[PDB]
Structures are given as C-alpha cells and as structure tokens.
Design a protein around this ligand. Structure first.
Ligand code: MG
Length: 326
C-alpha cells in the first residue's frame, strides 16, 4: 500500500510498570467501587471491608478506658482528701507548739525576775546571818530575811516544775508530728500507684489510636492516579492483609507492542515515527516512536507513546499500526 510505511494489525497495548494494591488488614469484602478498566484518582476508594470486628475491638478498649478513668479520679479524690487531712491537721499541732513555746517563754522570764531577787536576798541572808551570830542584830531581823528567801525559793521551783511539765507536753506534741511524716510517706506510697494508672492509660490511648487505624484501613484507597488493570476480589471474599485486590497502571507506563513480520521490517529503526489506531477509539490517533526492537515469523517491536490521551488506554487493546521506514 505504501513503502514509506510498515503497516501491521498485530498490536497489543501493554503496561511496563503496574502496582498491586492490598488492604493493610484482613477482613470480608463488602463493597467494590471500581472495576477492571476504571480510571481512578489518587485518594478514591476502590473497595471496602466489613469493619464491625475492628470497631468492636476499639470499643472494647474504650470500655476499659473509662474504667481506668473511674479509678484515676476515684483516688485523686482519696489522695487529695488525705492531703487536706494533714494540712489542717498539722497546722493545728503547729499552733499548739507555738502556743506552748510562748506560754513557756512567759515563765522563763518570770523565773528570771525571781532568780534576780533570790540573788539579792541570798546576800542579805548571808550578811544578816553573820550579824546575828555576832550579836549585832535581833533574831527577828534575820529570820525575817530567811522566810522571805523561803517564799522566793519555793515560788521558784513552782515556776520550774511548771516548766519541765510544759516541756514534756511540748515534746509529746512534737512526736505526734513525726507520726504525720509516716502519714505523707503512706500518701506517697498511694501516689506511686496514680502514675502507674495513667501509665496504663497512656498505653491504652495508644492501643485505641492503633485500632482506629485498622478501622480506617478497611477502605482501600488509590495510592496514585491510574487505571484498574485487574480486579482479584469479589463482594464476600475473605482477604488477608497484603493480599492483592487490584492492579493499578500508571498511565505513563503504557506502550504499544507490535509483532512485525521480518520481511516488512526493511527500513524500520529505533527513533522512527509511528502511528496507532485502536479499535476502541476511532476518533483518536495515538502517536509515537520506535523505542526498541528485539533480536509468519514475527518480530516484537516496542513503541513509546508521544501524543494521545493516556488515561484512555487499557492493557490488551488492539488495532492497526503504521511505522515509518527510512
Ligand atoms: Mg482494523
């Protein structure tokens, strides 16, 4: 027909790089949104699994979650009720030490004044004694001093027994303070449990987060723009994680493969123009160059596409092809 053009009807649309899609979890397919031949946009849902199980699993965890928030606050009350069972309780024993210590400092000063007087009257006593021995004073004057000294002396150790008695009671109130140091130590023992509870919560929020992933993974969405080259699954099939559900072809992957009789290969060569008419698309002329030639006896020639709507091609399409001789 034309010696400028090798013409052939042995043409196959093929795909170099396709990708297999899978669910990241296992389950029962319940819906198929896309089929063999569909063009799909990155993000589209292709198919969906029954999620009830993964949703139960999540909510089984949300039960146990609120059952650990009904303990966290249960003994956040308990530990803040023992924390005020010692604050108003210690501030009271503190004032009855700051009240005994002032009541004591009142005595220790009246005791000092009395000890002042006793110092003087002791001297008078010594003197008046010596003067009575020598006949230089009446006895009336010396015993007068003597019984004054007796008064001061037993109004003294009245003050000082009234001191060692207000000092043992103080020491007792001060031991009672040490008991509350064992109180807060048992509170901190109760507190080594609160942080081990919100540590069981920290890891539960994580198990939840992971369950919500499994639930989200029940919808198979498309990782890139492409056309569905194969569909391996049907409604009601049980699939496994990572098991192929579709094959997706990157439209840039498409090429035409031509099986050329060796005879009509005369002037054909890598780089040469080529022209493809697929039966599926009468009103479109795909266009390309000869990418490579492999070493009734036909030779496979690979054609790279350079003009025409790639999103329209399907693996397996036939038609007619003209290659330019040189
Ligand atoms: Mg034809």
């Amino acid at each position: 027909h034309r010696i400028e053009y090798a013409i052939t009807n042995a043409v196959f649309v093929k795909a170099d790089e396709l990708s297999y899609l899978s669910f990241r979890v296992s389950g029962k397919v319940i819906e198929v949104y896309k089929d063999l031949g569909d063009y799909v946009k990155r993000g589209e849902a292709l198919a969906k699994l029954d999620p009830t199980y993964y949703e139960l699993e999540k909510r089984t965890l949300e039960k146990k979650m609120s059952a650990l928030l009904e303990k966290k606050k249960a003994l956040e009350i308990k530990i803040q009720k023992l924390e005020k069972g010692l604050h108003i309780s210690l501030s009271a024993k503190k004032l009855k030490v700051e009240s005994l210590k002032k009541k004591r400092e009142a005595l220790r000063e009246k005791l000092l004044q009395v000890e002042e007087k006793i110092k003087l009257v002791k001297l008078d006593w010594e003197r008046y004694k010596s003067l009575f021995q020598k006949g230089l004073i009446p006895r009336r004057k010396f015993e007068e001093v003597d019984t004054n000294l007796k008064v001061l002396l037993h109004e003294r150790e009245y003050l000082e027994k009234s001191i060692q008695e207000i000092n043992t009671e103080i020491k007792r109130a001060k031991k009672g303070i040490e008991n509350a140091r064992n109180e807060f130590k048992t509170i901190e023992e109760l507190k080594k449990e609160l942080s081990s509870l919100e540590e069981e919560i920290k890891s539960l929020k994580e198990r939840i987060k992971t369950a919500e992933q499994k639930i989200k993974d029940t919808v198979l969405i498309a990782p890139f723009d492409g056309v569905v080259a194969k569909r391996f699954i049907s409604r009601g099939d049980v699939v496994r994680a990572g098991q192929p559900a579709f094959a997706l072809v990157n439209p840039e992957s498409f090429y035409v493969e031509v099986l050329l009789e060796e005879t009509k290969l005369k002037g054909v060569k890598v780089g040469n123009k080529a022209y493809v008419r697929l039966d599926a698309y009468p009103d479109i002329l795909f266009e390309g160059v000869v990418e490579e030639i492999s070493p009734v006896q036909r030779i496979p020639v690979k054609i790279k596409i350079t003009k025409g709507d790639l999103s329209l091609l399907r693996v397996g399409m036939g038609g007619e092809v003209e290659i330019r001789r040189t």
